[PDB]
Amino acid sequence: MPHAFKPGDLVFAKMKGYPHWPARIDDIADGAVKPPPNKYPIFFFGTHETAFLGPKDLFPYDKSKDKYGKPNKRKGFNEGLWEIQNNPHASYS
DSSP, rough: OOOOOOTTTTEEEEOSSOOOOEEEEOOOOOTTOOTTTTTTTEEEEOOOOOOEEOGGEEEEEEHHHHHHHHHSTTTTHHHHHHHHHHHSSSSOO
C-alpha cells in the first residue's frame, strides 16, 4: 500500500497551462527555504525549475509514464524525459 510522498520519489507534476511534467520530490538543504504547509519542493527535469506543489498535482511515475511519458514540444520536456529515465537522482545544479 502507498506511503506519503518522500524525497527522491519520482512523479509527473501538473502545473496550470503545462502538460504533466517529469519531476522528483526534492530534499530541502540545510539553511534553505522551506515549502508552505502541505506542499512539497518539486524539481522539474529538463527545465531544472522548482515549484511547491501539493499531492493533488503529483502523479507517481511508474503508474503514469505510459500516459504521460511521451515527447512534447515544450522547452525542456524531452530533456526531462531523458533525465527521469536515465539519471533521476543526479545533481542537476
